[PDB]
Amino acid sequence: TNPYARGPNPTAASLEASAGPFTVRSFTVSRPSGYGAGTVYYPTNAGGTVGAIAIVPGYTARQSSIKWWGPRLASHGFVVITIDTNSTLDQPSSRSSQQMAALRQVASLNGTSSSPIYGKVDTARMGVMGWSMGGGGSLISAANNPSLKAAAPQAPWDSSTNFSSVTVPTLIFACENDSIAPVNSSALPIYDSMSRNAKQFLEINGGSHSCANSGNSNQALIGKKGVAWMKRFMDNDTRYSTFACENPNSTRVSDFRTANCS
Ligand SMILES: [Cl-]
């Protein structure tokens, strides 16, 4: 028995729906430490401790741009913290530091008897996500903290394209027509630079820079893939190996690549 496997056996329909099987509650962090603000989403009875994921927005953006991931992932068995940065103009390195600080506070709250997530988190199992500069920050977080178990940035933005040291399983969401973090000069070179890890590249057909944000028109496919990736690698849950590693074979995807996934 995989001690980290949670919830009923997955189906395409259960992964494509707006929410998974778990009931989700949330709270705003009272005294954020090391970042601007945060909302914690958690499942009320996942059947055991679950991993934690920290999600960071992009330049000038706030929690609303990435908020949909909170309920979506939490409803499948994760504690998710979506954060506002100290300043909306923070750079990827600062975003990475605040992302890790948010994860540290989730771990601290896990040991605080007054917190709603008291005893709900397996603090040894954590992941990182984020949009644009927050996606670049997620990759920096993975490079600097190889104990992280999964990463799934979307339209990542960073001055470098060489993340060759990353050993964390990394799923890159890309948007075909991105004019802010262009695929050919950012997302794809970042993907190609990683030779040590399970990795995946999923490009949304005709998508703009915000193609993976709250309110996007591909929440069924993007949500399915994001949850499947997190489940497969944060929980070592091989029930999700096919969903995580498969080509969707969908006209909504203009480019799909994967390596070392199974
Ligand atoms: Cl950005």
From Swiss-Prot:
Activity control: Salts and glycerol enhance the enzymatic activity in vitro towards pNP-esters, while detergents and organic solvents reduce the enzymatic activity.
Any one Gene Ontology molecular-function term assigned to this protein's record = carboxylic ester hydrolase activity
Q: Which UniProt keywords apply?
A: Disulfide bond, Hydrolase, Secreted, Serine esterase, Signal
Q: How does activity depend on pH?
A: Optimum pH is 9 for PET film hydrolysis. Optimum pH is 9 for PET (commercial drinking bottle) hydrolysis. Optimum pH is 6.5-8.0 for BHET hydrolysis. Optimum pH is 8.0 for the hydrolysis of pNP-esters. The enzyme is active at pH 6-10, has an optimal pH range of 7-9 and it is rapidly inactivated below pH 7.0 or above pH 9.0.
> Has the keyword DNA-binding been applied to this entry?
no
Q: Which reaction does it catalyse?
A: (ethylene terephthalate)(n) + H2O = (ethylene terephthalate)(n-1) + 4-[(2-hydroxyethoxy)carbonyl]benzoate + H(+); (2,5-ethylene furandicarboxylate)(n) + 2 H2O = (2,5-ethylene furandicarboxylate)(n-1) + 2,5-dicarboxyfuran + ethylene glycol + 2 H(+); an acetyl ester + H2O = an aliphatic alcohol + acetate + H(+); a butanoate ester + H2O = an aliphatic alcohol + butanoate + H(+)
Report the outcome of residue 209 to A. Answer: Loss of enzymatic activity on PET bottle and on BHET
Pathways per UniProt: Xenobiotic degradation
Summarize the biotechnology note.
Answer: Has potential for application in environmental remediation and biological recycling of PET and PEF waste products.
What biological-process terms (Gene Ontology) are attached? xenobiotic catabolic process
Variant or mutagenesis effect after changing residue 158 to H: Displays increased thermostability and increased PET degradation activity by 14-fold at 40 degrees Celsius
Active-site residues, Swiss-Prot/TrEMBL: 132, 178, 209
Describe how expression is induced or repressed: Highly up-regulated during growth on PET film.
Give, from the UniProt record, the effect of changing residue 213 to A.
Displays decreased enzymatic activity on PET film and on BHET
- Output a single Gene Ontology CC term carried by this record: extracellular region
Return the broad EC class: hydrolase
Amino acids binding poly(ethylene terephthalate): 59, 133, 157
Resulting phenotype, residue 157 to A: Exhibits highly impaired PET degradation capacity relative to wild-type PETase. Also displays decreased enzymatic activity on BHET
Q: Write the Enzyme Commission number(s) for this entry.
A: 3.1.1.101
Q: Tell me which family the UniProt entry assigns to this protein.
A: Belongs to the AB hydrolase superfamily.
The text the record gives for the protein's domains is: PETase retains the ancestral alpha/beta-hydrolase fold but exhibits a more open active-site cleft than homologous cutinases.
Role noted for this protein: Involved in the degradation and assimilation of the plastic poly(ethylene terephthalate) (PET), which allows I.sakaiensis to use PET as its major energy and carbon source for growth. Likely acts synergistically with MHETase to depolymerize PET. Catalyzes the hydrolysis of PET to produce mono(2-hydroxyethyl) terephthalate (MHET) as the major product. Also depolymerizes another semiaromatic polyester, poly(ethylene-2,5-furandicarboxylate) (PEF), which is an emerging, bioderived PET replacement with improved gas barrier properties.
* Subunit text: Monomer.
Name it: Poly(ethylene terephthalate) hydrolase
